């Protein structure tokens, strides 16, 4: 099965450069063009450029020609996109995508995307608050718990619920940006027969700030 594995989210400052990678597997790396595509939040897809891995030959969208450099390493079957002189308008999700040269060049397999944030805002760890029902509350056959993850930057963050051997329903609420800081929340629902008896923990990883916090939900 073909996989295009891209590097993790990056935060860089205006004027700086970034280099995003795309490691190919499951097909002949040298046989197919590698393309790069920008998607701004709002969602128009724009082609940036392509590289022919065998020759190292490249072709660019003139809108990106001057700031983008495409390269490959055919010892690791990895394609690279370096973007220089970055600005906030470059904040977007970037994809690599395999092209089908001998069928005219449509894109057939895409990487998972890499989120780029261009900003002078500072990397900041989250505060994590467990959300348990109040003492005045009651619950039916199910109970809902939550985790509020507040005041972090940049956006890359993972909230993981561990409910042990319980089956659960999770909702993850998209982050909102305020004052250069993100806030998000997540809910988990388990049977009322099982909490607080069984441990339910919210695990928050924010790689940028080297933060990993785990908060056990406790009855109020």
């Amino acid at each position: 099965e073909i996989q295009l594995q891209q590097s993790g989210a990056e935060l860089v400052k205006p004027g700086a450069s970034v280099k995003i990678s795309c490691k190919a597997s499951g097909y002949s790396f040298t046989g197919y063009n590698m393309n790069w595509v920008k998607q701004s939040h709002g969602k128009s897809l724009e082609w940036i450029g392509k590289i022919n891995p065998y020759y190292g030959s490249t072709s660019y969208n003139q809108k990106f020609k001057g700031q983008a450099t495409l390269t490959v390493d055919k010892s690791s079957s990895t394609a690279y996109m370096q973007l220089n002189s970055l600005t906030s308008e470059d904040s977007a999700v970037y994809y690599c995508a395999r092209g089908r040269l001998r069928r005219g060049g449509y894109f057939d397999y895409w990487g998972q995307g890499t989120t780029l944030t261009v900003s002078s805002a500072k990397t900041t760890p989250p505060s994590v608050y467990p959300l348990a029902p109040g003492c005045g509350d009651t619950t039916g056959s199910s109970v809902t718990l939550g985790c509020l993850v507040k005041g972090y930057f940049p956006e890359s963050v993972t909230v993981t619920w561990n409910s042990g051997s319980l089956s659960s329903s999770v909702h993850t609420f998209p982050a909102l940006l305020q004052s250069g800081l993100y806030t998000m929340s997540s809910s988990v629902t388990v049977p009322s027969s099982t909490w607080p008896s069984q441990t339910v923990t919210c695990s928050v990883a924010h790689p940028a700030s080297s933060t990993t916090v785990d908060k056990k939900l406790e009855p109020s």
């Binding site: 894109f107 005045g136 909702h171 806030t183």
Partner: protein, 219 residues
Amino acid sequence: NIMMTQSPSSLAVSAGEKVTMSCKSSQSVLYSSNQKNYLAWYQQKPGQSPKLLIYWASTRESGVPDRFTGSGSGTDFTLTISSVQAEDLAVYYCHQHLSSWTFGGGTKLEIKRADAAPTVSIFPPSSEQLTSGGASVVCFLNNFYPKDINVKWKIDGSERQNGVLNSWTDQDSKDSTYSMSSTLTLTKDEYERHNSYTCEATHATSTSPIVKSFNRNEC
């Protein structure tokens, strides 16, 4: 160059309805020498990368369900879903690769379903946050339809919509519902000078809300 125009920008239909979306190119994408149309269609689901559905205008990519059909030639193309399923919510993009590579602006497909009331849960500020001088009051409204629900906060029986942060999930790919979080941001002082806190959820359609309340003075 070659510009791609898609219509409609968005549409909502119930599962089981047929949908036709269009893609127009500003120049022909029919390659003279092989008489193939260099036109592809992609599906991009929430949180995911685009996936190839159709290439050469009408050829279904391996693995793609038969309900997706691409048609057209020259400048005029359509993608049809014969019978929409819940999992088909996505943005659909057309793409040409005859002269450079360009994309359409996308058609966002949403699913209609029967109205569903939210399961509502309210959470007092934790003592952890309170000791730190903040007070966020959180309310979850889970698994409801339609999207445009009203959430109102009442403090001591009177409304405040000042300082409310609302975040909706993307539509659920299995049951077609939405969920949302509503957070009421207060200073500790603001929080401590009132007692009853209520989150109310109402469909725009009716006047029968679902309410969840707590009292600060209790526990």
